[PDB]
Amino acid sequence: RLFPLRCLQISSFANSSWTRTDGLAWLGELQTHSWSQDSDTVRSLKPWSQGTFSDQQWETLQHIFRVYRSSFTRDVKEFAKMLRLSYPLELQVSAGCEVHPGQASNNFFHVAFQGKDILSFQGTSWEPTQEAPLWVNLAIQVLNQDKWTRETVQWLLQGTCPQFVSGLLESGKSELKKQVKPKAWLSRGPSPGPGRLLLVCHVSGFYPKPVWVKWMRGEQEQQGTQPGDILPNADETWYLRATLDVVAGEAAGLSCRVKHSSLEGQDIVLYWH
Amino acid sequence: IQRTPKIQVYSRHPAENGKSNFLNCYVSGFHPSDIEVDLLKNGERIEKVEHSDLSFSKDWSFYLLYYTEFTPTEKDEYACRVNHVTLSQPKIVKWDRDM
Numbered sequence A: 001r002l003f004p005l006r007c008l009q010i011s012s013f014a015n016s017s018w019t020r021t022d023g024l025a026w027l028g029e030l031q032t033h034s035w036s037q038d039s040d041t042v043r044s045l046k047p048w049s050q051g052t053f054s055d056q057q058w059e060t061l062q063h064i065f066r067v068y069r070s071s072f073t074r075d076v077k078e079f080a081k082m083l084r085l086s087y088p089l090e091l092q093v094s095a096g097c098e099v100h101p102g103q104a105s106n107n108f109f110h111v112a113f114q115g116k117d118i119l120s121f122q123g124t125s126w127e128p129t130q131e132a133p134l135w136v137n138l139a140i141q142v143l144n145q146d147k148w149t150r151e152t153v154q155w156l157l158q159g160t161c162p163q164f165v166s167g168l169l170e171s172g173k174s175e176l177k178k179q180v181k182p183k184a185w186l187s188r189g190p191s192p193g194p195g196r197l198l199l200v201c202h203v204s205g206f207y208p209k210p211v212w213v214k215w216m217r218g219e220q221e222q223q224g225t226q227p228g229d230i231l232p233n234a235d236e237t238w239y240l241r242a243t244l245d246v247v248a249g250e251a252a253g254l255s256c257r258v259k260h261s262s263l264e265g266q267d268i269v270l271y272w273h
Numbered sequence B: 001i002q003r004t005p006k007i008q009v010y011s012r013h014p015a016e017n018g019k020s021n022f023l024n025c026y027v028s029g030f031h032p033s034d035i036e037v038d039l040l041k042n043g044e045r046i047e048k049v050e051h052s053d054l055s056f057s058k059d060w061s062f063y064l065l066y067y068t069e070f071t072p073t074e075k076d077e078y079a080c081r082v083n084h085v086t087l088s089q090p091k092i093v094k095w096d097r098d099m
């Protein structure tokens, strides 16, 4: 489907002296990049991670990030002192873009404070989110003064990112587009009764993410099927559990049904026995 | 101190005693980022673990994948132990193979 580039940053300020900044990049659901603070380097996680970029080009990005990390850090502590914001601080940034086949290109740059949205880069400048407390508005006024940073951010988003991503997509398409068939198993959960049964269905090892799992009686979906969260494996496939709270007598004839794009129309059907 | 961690333990493949597997622990939805996570075997800490990079989701809550290679058995009890600012005492969630 679509494969957005999501650049994540986690900056934690415990006090004025202690801070930690880490980042990662996700292309679609695949993590392509790692940025630790115990390293002045951005680690590529896939052979196609560098896209169609030279080492010269890449090695500069390396340096530009270090300057960014430190600038951001002192700027934050400074806003904290001006606006009388109390430590510790949890700043997060979600920025990137996604390429559309094959005309336009949309982008985004969101920042959060203490886990709540405060502002984003909309058009040639910073805007606060509607909920934002008023100190964020003072911050916006300061931020928007820096025309240099603005044009820079606008350039990265509207220019660099799209160009970068296109490269990644070309080089990594094969891995992005891969399909991995899941396997499923049944089991008996903790008794909600007695005298009841908790029918549990396990589906694991599927890629990509979108899946369909419902308990069935023949072709009748069981309104009552309760699917869990889609959980990740270490190998970039997922895991999903679907349960049904039923009177023991009902279990007979009941089946668990898995629909996934990798199965090519051939649903997995497990029968309770 | 805002959002407290969800803890979910599960295996890569269906448990078969005496066969090689991977035990996963997914800690999610917590905030702030400061956290401590351990996989447990029979109460004791598992040293040869692996974890993912701290990340977060659209709603800004943080998540973390821990996993280790293991072999299930009738006797061994596996678990996942988490500590966080939002908890008064470390929380333990037990791997249940039939759940």
Ligand SMILES: *[C@@H]1O[C@H](CO[C@@H]2O[C@@H](C)[C@@H](O)[C@@H](O)[C@@H]2O)[C@@H](O[C@@H]2O[C@H](CO)[C@@H](O)[C@H](O)[C@H]2NC(C)=O)[C@H](O[C@@H]2O[C@@H](C)[C@@H](O)[C@@H](O)[C@@H]2O)[C@H]1NC(C)=O
Binding pocket: A014, A015, A016, A017, A018
């Ligand atoms: C800023 O914070 C340091 C502690 O960092 C903590 O990290 C986690 C443990 C968690 O508590 C987090 O919320 C805190 O932010 C303070 O103290 C010590 O830093 C030293 C470094 O060697 C380390 O032992 C610990 O992180 C911590 N030690 C403790 C409390 O046992 C710093 O405060 C002090 O700074 C010195 C001038 C002195 O006052 C000493 O007590 C602490 O190091 C904080 N930084 C500063 C310089 O103010």
Ligand SMILES: CCCCCCCC/C=C/CCCCCCCC(=O)OC[C@@H](O)COP(=O)(O)OCC[N+](C)(C)C
Binding pocket: A067, A068, A071, A072, A075, A076, A079, A080, A085, A089, A111, A113, A139, A148, A149, A152
């Ligand atoms: C606690 C409240 C926090 C609210 C603040 C949230 C701000 C989120 C916005 C972040 C945008 C980046 C902010 C960091 C400052 C600049 C970022 C950047 O991407 O450029 C770095 C640049 O600032 C280099 O250092 P400098 O010394 O400031 O200047 C260099 C540019 N000149 C001097 C060449 C013009």
Ligand SMILES: CCCCCCCCCCC
Binding pocket: A007, A008, A009, A023, A024, A025, A033, A035, A042, A093, A095
């Ligand atoms: C090119 C991938 C490197 C991503 C590192 C994380 C950066 C997140 C902050 C974006 C301004």
Ligand SMILES: CCCCCC
Binding pocket: A007, A095, A096, A156, A157, A160, A161, A164
């Ligand atoms: C600012 C997000 C895009 C960065 C491309 C290297």
